[PDB]
Amino acid sequence: TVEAKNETFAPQHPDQYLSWKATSEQSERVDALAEDPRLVILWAGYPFSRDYNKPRGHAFAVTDVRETLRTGAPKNAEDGPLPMACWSCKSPDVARLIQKDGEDGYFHGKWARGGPEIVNNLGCADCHNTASPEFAKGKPELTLSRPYAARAMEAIGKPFEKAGRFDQQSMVCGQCHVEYYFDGKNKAVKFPWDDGMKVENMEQYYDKIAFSDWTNSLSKTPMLKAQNPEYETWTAGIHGKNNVTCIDCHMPKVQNAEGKLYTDHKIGNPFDNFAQTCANCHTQDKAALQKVVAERKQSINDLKIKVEDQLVHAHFEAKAALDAGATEAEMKPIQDDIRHAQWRWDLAIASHGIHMHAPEEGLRMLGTAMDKAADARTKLARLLATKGITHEIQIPDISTKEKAQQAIGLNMEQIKAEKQDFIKTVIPQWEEQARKNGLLS
Amino acid sequence: TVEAKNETFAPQHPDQYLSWKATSEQSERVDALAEDPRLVILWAGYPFSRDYNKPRGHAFAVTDVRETLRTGAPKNAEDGPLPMACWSCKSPDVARLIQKDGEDGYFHGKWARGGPEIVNNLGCADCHNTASPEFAKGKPELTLSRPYAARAMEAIGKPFEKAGRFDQQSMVCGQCHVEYYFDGKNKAVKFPWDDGMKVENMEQYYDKIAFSDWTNSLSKTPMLKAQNPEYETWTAGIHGKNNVTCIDCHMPKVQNAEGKLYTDHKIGNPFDNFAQTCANCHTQDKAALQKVVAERKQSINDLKIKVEDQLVHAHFEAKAALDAGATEAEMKPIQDDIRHAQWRWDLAIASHGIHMHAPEEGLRMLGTAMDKAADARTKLARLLATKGITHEIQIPDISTKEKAQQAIGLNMEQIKAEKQDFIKTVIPQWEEQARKNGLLS
Numbered sequence: 001t002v003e004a005k006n007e008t009f010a011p012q013h014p015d016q017y018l019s020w021k022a023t024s025e026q027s028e029r030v031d032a033l034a035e036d037p038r039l040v041i042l043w044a045g046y047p048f049s050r051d052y053n054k055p056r057g058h059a060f061a062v063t064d065v066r067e068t069l070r071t072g073a074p075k076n077a078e079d080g081p082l083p084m085a086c087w088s089c090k091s092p093d094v095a096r097l098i099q100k101d102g103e104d105g106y107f108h109g110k111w112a113r114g115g116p117e118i119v120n121n122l123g124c125a126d127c128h129n130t131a132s133p134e135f136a137k138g139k140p141e142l143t144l145s146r147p148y149a150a151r152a153m154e155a156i157g158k159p160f161e162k163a164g165r166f167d168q169q170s171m172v173c174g175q176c177h178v179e180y181y182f183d184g185k186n187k188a189v190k191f192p193w194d195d196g197m198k199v200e201n202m203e204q205y206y207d208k209i210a211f212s213d214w215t216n217s218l219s220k221t222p223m224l225k226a227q228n229p230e231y232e233t234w235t236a237g238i239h240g241k242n243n244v245t246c247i248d249c250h251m252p253k254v255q256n257a258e259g260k261l262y263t264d265h266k267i268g269n270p271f272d273n274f275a276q277t278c279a280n281c282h283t284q285d286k287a288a289l290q291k292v293v294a295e296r297k298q299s300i301n302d303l304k305i306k307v308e309d310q311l312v313h314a315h316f317e318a319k320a321a322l323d324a325g326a327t328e329a330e331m332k333p334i335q336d337d338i339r340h341a342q343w344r345w346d347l348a349i350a351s352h353g354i355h356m357h358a359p360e361e362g363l364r365m366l367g368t369a370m371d372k373a374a375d376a377r378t379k380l381a382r383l384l385a386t387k388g389i390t391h392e393i394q395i396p397d398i399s400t401k402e403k404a405q406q407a408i409g410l411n412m413e414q415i416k417a418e419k420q421d422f423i424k425t426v427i428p429q430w431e432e433q434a435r436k437n438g439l440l441s
Numbered sequence: 442t443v444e445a446k447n448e449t450f451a452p453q454h455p456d457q458y459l460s461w462k463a464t465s466e467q468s469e470r471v472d473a474l475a476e477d478p479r480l481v482i483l484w485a486g487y488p489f490s491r492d493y494n495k496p497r498g499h500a501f502a503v504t505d506v507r508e509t510l511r512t513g514a515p516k517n518a519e520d521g522p523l524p525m526a527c528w529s530c531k532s533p534d535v536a537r538l539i540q541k542d543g544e545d546g547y548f549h550g551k552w553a554r555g556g557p558e559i560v561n562n563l564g565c566a567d568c569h570n571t572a573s574p575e576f577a578k579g580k581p582e583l584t585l586s587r588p589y590a591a592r593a594m595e596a597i598g599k600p601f602e603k604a605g606r607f608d609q610q611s612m613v614c615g616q617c618h619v620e621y622y623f624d625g626k627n628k629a630v631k632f633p634w635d636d637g638m639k640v641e642n643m644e645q646y647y648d649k650i651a652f653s654d655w656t657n658s659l660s661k662t663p664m665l666k667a668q669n670p671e672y673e674t675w676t677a678g679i680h681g682k683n684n685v686t687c688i689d690c691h692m693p694k695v696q697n698a699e700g701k702l703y704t705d706h707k708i709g710n711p712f713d714n715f716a717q718t719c720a721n722c723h724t725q726d727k728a729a730l731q732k733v734v735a736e737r738k739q740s741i742n743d744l745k746i747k748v749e750d751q752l753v754h755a756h757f758e759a760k761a762a763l764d765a766g767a768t769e770a771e772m773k774p775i776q777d778d779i780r781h782a783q784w785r786w787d788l789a790i791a792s793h794g795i796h797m798h799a800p801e802e803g804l805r806m807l808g809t810a811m812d813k814a815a816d817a818r819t820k821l822a823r824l825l826a827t828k829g830i831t832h833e834i835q836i837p838d839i840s841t842k843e844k845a846q847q848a849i850g851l852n853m854e855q856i857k858a859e860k861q862d863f864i865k866t867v868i869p870q871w872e873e874q875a876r877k878n879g880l881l882s
C-alpha cells in the first residue's frame with residue numbers, strides 16, 4: 001500500500017507537488033573529479049575514481065544512479081559491480097519493495113535486478129506516510145520509510161516515533177544524507193552510529209570489526225569511504241545545537257498565489273529564498289551572509305587540498321615501498337595511518353555543505369587527518385631508506401582527470417563506451433517493463 | 442601632563458576606580474609550562490622556555506613583569522637580558538616616560554633602567570585622555586596613549602581619531618592585546634600589520650625583512666615568536682565581524698547602587714556577569730553557552746597537542762641530523778618548514794581567548810601548521826637516511842616541565858635562586874627610590 005507514483009498526489013496537493021517537481025530546474029551536473037583530479041588517486045581501485053559529480057536536484061537521483069559510471073553496464077539482472085542497496089536513497093519504489101518483499105528480500109542481489117522496479121523519482125512516500133487518511137487532508141504524517149534509518153535513529157537515543165515534530169523534520173533527511181556502509185552478505189545499508197556520530201566514534205566502529213570498503217590499488221591500503229554525513233555534521237554545528245532544522249533552511253514556509261502558507265518542496269540552495277530562510281532569524285543582509293559562507297568555504301577548500309596533496313604523496317610512496325619489496329608486516333603500520341588519515345579527510349569534506357553546517361568541525365577533522373598523513377609519510381621515508389631509497393618519490397602527471405585516470409590504470413575509453421551502450425539500450429527496456437507492470441505512468 | 446598615579450582619580454571617579462582596582466581579585470597565576478612541557482622544547486633558547494604563565498588581572502601586570510624569570514636578575518641599569526620595551530604594555534608610567542623623554546628615549550637601553558620609574562599599575566592614562574576637561578565630567582575621552590599603536594591602526598586603514606566610538610572601544614585593548622616584535626637597534630615596539638593581520642600576511646612581513654625572534658637551540662631554526670594576538674583574531678571572528686567589541690563582553694555597562702550607569706572596569710571573564718554580557722544579545726542560558734565554549738576549547742586543545750608533538754619530534758630530529766653531520770645548506774629547507782609550522786601553531790594558540798573569539802581561525806591555522814610540520818619531518822627522515830640513520834629518533838623524557846627544562850640544559854635551581862634574590866633585594870630599592878622621587882605614593 002505505499003504509493004510510489006508521485007503524480008497520484010498532484011490533484012490533492014498542488015503546492016507541494018509543483019515545488020517538489022521544480023527540483024528539475026536544479027540540473028547542472030558538475031564533474032567533481034575534473035575539478036579535483038587528486039580524488040582519482042585517493043579513490044584508486046574504487047568506483048568513485050571513475051565518476052563522481054556534485055549532487056543536483058532530487059528529481060535527478062534516479063537518472064544519476066542509472067548514468068553514473070559507478071554502476072557500470074550490467075548485461076543482466078545478475079551482473080554489474082554493485083548491489084541492490086545502491087537504489088536505497090534514490091526512489092520511493094525502495095519503500096514499495098521493502099514493504100512488498102521485506103528488507104532482506106529488497107537488499108538481495110545486484111543493482112541491475114532493481115532496474116525495472118525502482119523507477120519513480122525521489123518522492124512523497126520517501127518522507128510521508130501517504131497511506132494515512134490524514135495525509136489526503138493535508139497533514140504531513142512524516143515517516144521513516146527506511147527501516148535501517150529507524151534503527152539508526154534509535155541507536156543515537158532518538159527513536160523517531162517519540163521525537164517531537166521538529167526533531168522528526170531533520171530525521172527524514174537523515175534517512176539518506178548520512179555516512180553509511182554495506183553490512184553482511186546481502187550488503188544491507190547500515191549507519192555506523194552505535195558509538196555516536198563523531199568522526200572518532202565511527203572510526204572506532206569500523207576498526208573494531210576491521211571493516212574496509214576497498215583496497216587502494218596504489219598503496220594496498222584497506223580504506224574507508226565516507227559519504228555525505230550531513231545529519232552527523234549538522235548535529236555537531238551551531239545551527240543543529242540550536243534546533244535549527246534542515247527544513248528551516250531548505251524547505252521554508254512560503255505563501256502561494258492566494259496567500260496560503262505551505263512548505264516549499266523545491267529543495268535546494270537556501271540562499272535562493274533568503275527572505276524566507278536566513279532573514280527569519282538574522283538581521284544581516286544577504287550579501288553579508290553569503291560572504292561569510294564563501295570565506296568558510298575557501299578556508300576549508302585550501303586546507304583540504306593541502307591534506308589531499310599529502311595523501312597523494314603517501315599513496316605513491318607506499319607503492320614505491322611495495323615495488324622495492326616491502327613485506328605486509330612492514331606496510332601495516334603505514335597502511336593504518338593512511339586509512340585513518342583518509343577517513344578523516346573524506347568524512348570532513350564528503351559533505352558539500354560542511355562550510356555552512358559545521359565549518360569548525362570540518363576544519364578540526366582536516367587537522368586530525370593531516371596528523372596521521374604526516375605519520376604515514378615519515379614512516380614511509382624511513383621504510384624506503386631501509387630499502388636503499390633516500391630520494392623524493394616522483395609522482396606521475398595527475399594534472400587532469402583523464403591523466404590521473406590513465407595513471408591508475410583505468411581504460412576510460414572502453415568504460416565510457418560500455419556505459420553509453422547500457423544507457424541507450426537497457427534503460428528503455430527497464431522503463432518498458434515498469435510501465436507494463438503499472439509501476440510507472 | 443600624563444598622570445600615572447591612578448589613585449589621583451579615586452575621589453572624582455569612584456565607580457570606575459573601585460571596579461578597576463578589583464582586577465586584583467583575579468590573582469591566580471597558572472603555570473602554562475607545567476600544564477604543557479612541550480612548550481619548553483618549542484621555545485628552547487628563548488626566555489619563554491624558562492617561565493610562562495597564563496594571564497591574570499591587570500592589577501598584576503607590573504608585578505608579573507618584575508617577577509618573571511624571563512626578565513632575569515639585573516644587578517644594575519645596563520644589566521639583564523631584556524630591553525626597555527618589556528615595560529610598554531604594563532603601566533601608565535610608560536605614557537609618562539614617552540611624553541617626558543619621547544618614544545626613542547623611552548625605548549633606549551635595558552628593562553632594568555626603567556625599574557625605579559615604571560611603578561604604577563596599568564591604569565587610567567593608558568586608555569584615557571585624563572587631561573581633557575571632559576574626563577572629570579564623566580566622559581571617557583578614549584585615547585591611544587601608545588604611538589606605535591596609533592601608527593599600527595593607521596596601517597590597517599583605521600586611524601583612531603577618525604574611527605567611530607565602537608571601533609575606538611576595541612582599539613584601546615588593541616594597544617597591548619596584539620602580536621608585536623622589537624624593531625631596530627633600540628628595540629622599539631612594532632605591530633607586524635603593514636600587509637594586514639592574517640597569519641599569512643604577518644608571515645610575509647617577517648620573511649620580507651628576514652626577521653627572527655631567536656634561534657631554537659635544538660634545531661638551530663631561526664624562529665618567530667607569537668604574542669597574544671587578540672585584536673587580530675577577534676577581527677577575524679564572527680563577533681568582530683558583527684562589531685561586537687571587546688567591551689561588550691569584558692567591560693559591560695552596569696548600574697551603581699544609586700542606579701547611575703557606568704562601565705564596569707573589572708576586566709575579566711565575561712561569564713562572571715553573564716546577565717550583562719552574553720545575555721544582552723543571546724537567549725540561550727549561561728550553562729548552554731559555557732558548554733559550547735568549553736567544547737571549542739577542548740577541540741583546539743586536542744588538535745594543538747597533536748601539532749606540538751609533531752614539532753617536538755621535528756626539533757629533536759633536526760638536532761639528530763646536525764649531530765650526524767648535516768650542513769647549513771642541507772638544514773635550510775627543513776628549518777624554513779619548522780619556522781613556518783611553528784609560526785602558524787604559535788599564532789593560532791598564543792591567544793588564550795581564541796576558542797571564544799575566532800575558533801574556526803585557530804583551527805584553520807593549526808591545520809596549516811600541521812602541513813608544514815609534516816614536510817619538515819619527511820625531509821628530515823630522508824636527510825637522516827643519507828647519513829645512515831633509518832630508525833625513529835628517540836626523544837628525551839619531557840613528561841614534566843622540570844624534565845623538559847633539564848633536557849634543554851637550563852639550570853633551573855640556579856636561575857630561580859638568582860630571581861628570588863633580585864625579587865627580595867632590588868624590587869624594594871626600586872619602589873623606595875620611586876617613592877623618594879614622587880613617582881609612587
Ligand code: HEC
Pocket residue numbers: 051052053054055056064065068070071082085086087088089175176177178180189228350351352
Ligand atoms: C551504491 C554504491 C550507490 C551508488 C552507485 C550511488 N549511491 Fe548515492 N547519494 C546519497 C546522497 C545523500 C547523495 C547526494 C549527496 C552528495 O552526493 O553529497 C547521493 C548522490 C549520488 C549520485 C549523484 C552524485 C554523484 O556521486 O555523481 C550518484 C551517481 C549516486 N549517489 C550513486 C545517498 C546514498 C545512500 C543513502 C544511505 C546510499 C545507500 C547510496 N547513496 C548508495 C549509492
Ligand code: HEC
Pocket residue numbers: 006009010013016017020021122123124125126127128135138139140142165169172173247251261262263264265
Ligand atoms: C510529493 C510530490 C510530496 C507531496 C505531495 C508532499 N510532500 Fe512533503 N513535506 C516534507 C517535510 C519535512 C514537510 C514539513 C512537515 C512539517 O511542517 O513538520 C512536508 C510537508 C508536506 C505537507 C503538509 C502541508 C505543508 O505544506 O506543510 C504535505 C501535504 C506534503 N508535504 C506533501 C518532506 C518531504 C520530502 C522530504 C525529502 C519529500 C520528498 C516530500 N515531502 C514530498 C512530498
Ligand code: HEC
Pocket residue numbers: 026054055056057058059060061062064088089090091122126127172173174175176177246247250251267268269
Ligand atoms: C530532507 C527534507 C532533505 C534535505 C534538506 C535534502 N535532501 Fe536530499 N538528496 C538525495 C540524493 C540521492 C541527492 C543527489 C541527487 C542527484 O544528484 O541526482 C540529494 C540532493 C540534495 C540536495 C542538493 C540539491 C541541489 O540542487 O544540489 C539538497 C540541498 C538536499 N538533497 C537536501 C537523497 C535524499 C533522500 C533519499 C530518499 C531524502 C529522504 C533526502 N535526500 C532528503 C533531503
Ligand code: HEC
Pocket residue numbers: 054055056170173174177230231232234235239240244245246247248249250269270271293294297351352353356357
Ligand atoms: C539537515 C541535516 C540538513 C541537510 C540534510 C542539508 N542541510 Fe544544508 N545548506 C545550507 C546552505 C546555505 C547550503 C549552501 C552552501 C553554499 O551555498 O555554499 C547548504 C548545503 C547543503 C547541501 C549541499 C548542496 C549542494 O549543492 O552541494 C546539502 C546536501 C544540504 N545542505 C542538506 C543551509 C542549511 C542550514 C542553515 C541554517 C541548515 C540547518 C541546513 N542547511 C541543514 C541541512
Ligand code: HEC
Pocket residue numbers: 237238239242244248249270271277278279280281282289290292293356357359679723724725
Ligand atoms: C541562511 C542560509 C543562514 C545563514 C547563512 C546563517 N544562518 Fe544562522 N543562526 C541561528 C542561531 C540560533 C545561531 C547561533 C548564534 C545565536 O545564538 O544567535 C545562528 C548562527 C549563525 C552563524 C554563526 C555560526 C557559524 O556557523 O559560523 C552564521 C554564520 C549563520 N547563522 C548564518 C538561527 C538561524 C535560523 C533560525 C530558524 C535560521 C533559519 C538561520 N539561522 C539561517 C542562517
Ligand code: HEC
Pocket residue numbers: 467495496497498499500501502503505506529530531532563567568613614615616617618687688691692708709710
Ligand atoms: C581593553 C579594554 C582590554 C581588554 C578587554 C583586556 N585588556 Fe588586558 N592585559 C594586559 C596585560 C599585560 C595582561 C596580563 C596581566 C598579568 O597577568 O599580570 C592583561 C590581561 C588581560 C586579561 C586577563 C584577565 C584575567 O583574569 O585573566 C583580559 C581579560 C584583558 N587583559 C582584557 C595588558 C593590557 C593593556 C596594556 C596597557 C591594555 C590597554 C589592555 N590589556 C587592555 C585590555
Ligand code: HEC
Pocket residue numbers: 495496497611614615618671672675680681685686687688689690691710711712734735738792793794797798
Ligand atoms: C577585543 C580585541 C578582545 C580582547 C582584547 C579580549 N577579548 Fe575576550 N573572551 C571572551 C570570553 C567568554 C573569554 C573566556 C573564554 C573561556 O571562558 O573559556 C575570553 C577570553 C579572553 C582572554 C584570555 C583570558 C584568560 O584569562 O585566559 C583575553 C586576553 C581576552 N578575551 C581579551 C569573550 C569575548 C567577547 C565575546 C563576544 C568579545 C567580543 C571579546 N572577548 C573580545 C576580546
Ligand code: HEC
Pocket residue numbers: 238282283284679680683685689690711712718719720721722723730731733734797798800
Ligand atoms: C558572552 C561571553 C557571549 C558568548 C558566549 C557568545 N556571544 Fe555572541 N553573537 C552575536 C552576534 C551578532 C552573532 C552572530 C550570529 C548572529 O548573527 O546572530 C553571535 C554569535 C555567537 C555564537 C555562534 C558563533 C561562534 O562564534 O561559534 C556563539 C557561540 C556566541 N555568539 C556566544 C552577538 C553577541 C553580542 C552582541 C552585543 C554579545 C554581547 C555576545 N554575542 C556575547 C556572547
Ligand code: HEC
Pocket residue numbers: 492493494495496497505506509511512523526527528529530616617618619621630669791792793
Ligand atoms: C605590545 C604589548 C606587550 C609587550 C610589548 C610585552 N607584553 Fe607582556 N603581555 C602582554 C599582554 C597582552 C599579556 C597578557 C596576555 C597573554 O599573555 O596571553 C602579557 C603578559 C605578560 C606576563 C604575564 C604572563 C606570563 O607570560 O607569565 C609577563 C610575565 C610578561 N607579559 C612579560 C613581558 C616581557 C618580559 C616583555 C618584553 C620581552 C613583554 N611582556 C612585552 C603584552 C605585552
Ligand code: HEC
Pocket residue numbers: 447450451454457458459461563564565566567568569576579580581583606610613688692702703704705706
Ligand atoms: C584598559 C582600558 C581602561 C583603563 C585601564 C581604564 N579605563 Fe575607563 N573606560 C575604558 C573604556 C573602554 C570605557 C568605555 C568607553 C565607552 O563606553 O565608549 C571607559 C569608561 C570610563 C569613564 C566614562 C563613564 C563610564 O563609566 O562609562 C570614565 C570616567 C572612566 N572610564 C574612568 C577610568 C578611571 C578612573 C580609570 C582608572 C581607575 C580607568 N578608567 C581605567 C577603558 C579603561
Ligand SMILES: [Ca+2]
Pocket residue numbers: 054055056
Ligand atoms: Ca548542487
Ligand SMILES: [Ca+2]
Pocket residue numbers: 179180181224225226227
Ligand atoms: Ca561509508
Ligand SMILES: [Ca+2]
Pocket residue numbers: 495496497498
Ligand atoms: Ca586568566
Ligand SMILES: [Ca+2]
Pocket residue numbers: 620621622666667668
Ligand atoms: Ca612576536
